[PDB]
Amino acid sequence: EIVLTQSPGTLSLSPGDRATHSCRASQSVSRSYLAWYQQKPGQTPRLFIYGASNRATGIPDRFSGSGSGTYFTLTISRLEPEDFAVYYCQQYDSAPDTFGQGTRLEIKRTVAAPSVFIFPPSDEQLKSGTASVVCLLNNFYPREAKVQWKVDNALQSGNSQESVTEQDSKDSTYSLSSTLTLSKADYEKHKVYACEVTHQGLSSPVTKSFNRGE
Amino acid sequence: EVQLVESGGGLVQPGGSLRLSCAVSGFPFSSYWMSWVRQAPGKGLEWVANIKEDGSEKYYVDSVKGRFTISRDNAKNSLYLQMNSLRAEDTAVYYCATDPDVGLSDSWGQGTLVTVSSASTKGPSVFPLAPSSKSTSGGTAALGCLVKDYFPEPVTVSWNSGALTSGVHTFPAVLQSSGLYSLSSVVTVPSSSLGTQTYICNVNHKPSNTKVDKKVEPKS
Ligand SMILES: N[C@@H]1[C@@H](O)[C@H](O)[C@@H](CO[C@@H]2O[C@H](CO)[C@@H](O)[C@H](O)[C@H]2N)O[C@H]1O
Ligand SMILES: [Cl-]
Numbered sequence A: 001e002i003v004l005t006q007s008p009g010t011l012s013l014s015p016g017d018r019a020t021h022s023c024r025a026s027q028s029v030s031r032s033y034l035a036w037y038q039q040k041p042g043q044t045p046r047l048f049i050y051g052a053s054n055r056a057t058g059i060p061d062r063f064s065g066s067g068s069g070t071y072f073t074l075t076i077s078r079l080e081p082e083d084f085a086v087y088y089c090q091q092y093d094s095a096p097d098t099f100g101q102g103t104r105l106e107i108k109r110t111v112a113a114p115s116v117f118i119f120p121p122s123d124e125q126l127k128s129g130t131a132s133v134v135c136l137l138n139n140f141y142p143r144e145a146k147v148q149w150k151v152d153n154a155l156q157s158g159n160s161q162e163s164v165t166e167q168d169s170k171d172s173t174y175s176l177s178s179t180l181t182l183s184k185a186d187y188e189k190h191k192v193y194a195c196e197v198t199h200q201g202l203s204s205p206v207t208k209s210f211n212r213g214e
Numbered sequence B: 001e002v003q004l005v006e007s008g009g010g011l012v013q014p015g016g017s018l019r020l021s022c023a024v025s026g027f028p029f030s031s032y033w034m035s036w037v038r039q040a041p042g043k044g045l046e047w048v049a050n051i052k053e054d055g056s057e058k059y060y061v062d063s064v065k066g067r068f069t070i071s072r073d074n075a076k077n078s079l080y081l082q083m084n085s086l087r088a089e090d091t092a093v094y095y096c097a098t099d100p101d102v103g104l105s106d107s108w109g110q111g112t113l114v115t116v117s118s119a120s121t122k123g124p125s126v127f128p129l130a131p132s133s134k135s136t137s138g139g140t141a142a143l144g145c146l147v148k149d150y151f152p153e154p155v156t157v158s159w160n161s162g163a164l165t166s167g168v169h170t171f172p173a174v175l176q177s178s179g180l181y182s183l184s185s186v187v188t189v190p191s192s193s194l195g196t197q198t199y200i201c202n203v204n205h206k207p208s209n210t211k212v213d214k215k216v217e218p219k220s
Helices: A123-127
Strands: A004-007 A010-013 A019-029 A034-039 A046-050 A063-076 A085-091 A103-107 A115-119 A130-140 A146-151 A160-164 A174-183 A192-198 A206-211 B003-007 B010-012 B018-025 B034-039 B045-051 B058-060 B068-073 B078-083 B092-098 B112-116 B125-129 B140-150 B156-159 B168-170 B181-190 B200-205 B210-215
Touching: A004 A085, A010 A019, A019 A034, A019 A085, A019 A103, A034 A063, A046 A063, A063 A085, A085 B045, A115 A192, A115 A206, A115 B140, A123 A130, A123 B125, A130 A146, A130 A192, A130 B140, A130 B181, A146 A160, A146 A174, A160 B181, A174 B181, B003 B092, B018 B092, B018 B112, B034 B068, B034 B078, B045 B068, B045 B078, B058 B068, B078 B092, B125 B210, B140 B200, B156 B181
Parallel strands: A010 A103, B010 B112
Antiparallel strands: A004 A019, A019 A063, A034 A046, A034 A085, A085 A103, A115 A130, A130 A174, A146 A192, A160 A174, A192 A206, B003 B018, B018 B078, B034 B045, B034 B092, B045 B058, B068 B078, B092 B112, B125 B140, B140 B181, B156 B200, B168 B181, B200 B210
């Protein structure tokens, strides 16, 4: 097996910056049978580079590949906001036609604070024994954020889950949903439900709350 | 117009089998090596198998030798993966993937999720995330739909039958401790539209043949 090792594992660069993605092989890859793919979250990979340096159909000039032997690169000469992805190299010289582990490229932008919104459980859901409380953080950067749920001012742990959207292809922000899940019995023993958000763009943390049943 | 269309995936019992098909159009299929590549949830791409243009040479990852078989039908421009003795290690999105020498960006299929599990398809409950003063300022309101307790992936969510697209964020599903998935989809709209425009989320869970339309009504 030819092992392909990609570096860096993660890369964050701004529009206009030059991005370099490396692919090292454990033995020589002959015939420059080395490809690069772009994969966006939850989407089919697109072939970008084949034969080490050839652009695939529909690939813009800012993407280029180079290399031979054991060392290859994929360059984005001038980043555009639509260029975030995981980039994978693959050799197709000798089976198994192995992939590298990918480099996740994020598009850096200037700090952008989230808008925070809290949504009580719907009447319909409470009917059936469970309460989901949703806290939405909209359109922010960087991706790192801390959401703390408080119930009657007591810090919660273990009863929430979070999910984050892919980067916006035009303005490079993210959005995040946090869902607190309780039994209806537990839900009805408390009054104040609060989501407290800490983020680099907020000079001070922002708390959104409601009182149950109002 | 290059298209690779996969079928044959979905939920399958551990120890069971699936037959994956891939119908190719838009380039000379019979000139190229073809492959299957898979991606386990949250993981990287993994090459599975490939086949020469005439079928006469094929290679496999060791973990599937003797239980997966790659074949092709050049007459029907189709690629196949017959998968047997399936295990949870096989759970992944499977892509048919042309030899990169073809040089076409759009040379992989859309992917089919294979979930190796003894759980049953189960359709979501859909609850509104109603707009209110808490989701509304600066002339815009946020609203949405909580799509809760379904298995397996995936679901699709649209708004107003696809008429509403701007300002939509449909979150990646989270797997709950229950072993069921949940997801929210949210949209930001003009607060002035709340009296006037109807907002409906259209949820399709193909694995359970469940379709739900939920109207999301404003709070005072
Ligand atoms: N073990 C190899 C297999 O896994 C490779 O993908 C394959 C690719 O080389 C191919 O060469 C033919 C002709 O020589 C060319 O038309 C294809 O497009 C190449 N990708 O080689 C096997 O030996
Ligand atoms: Cl691989």
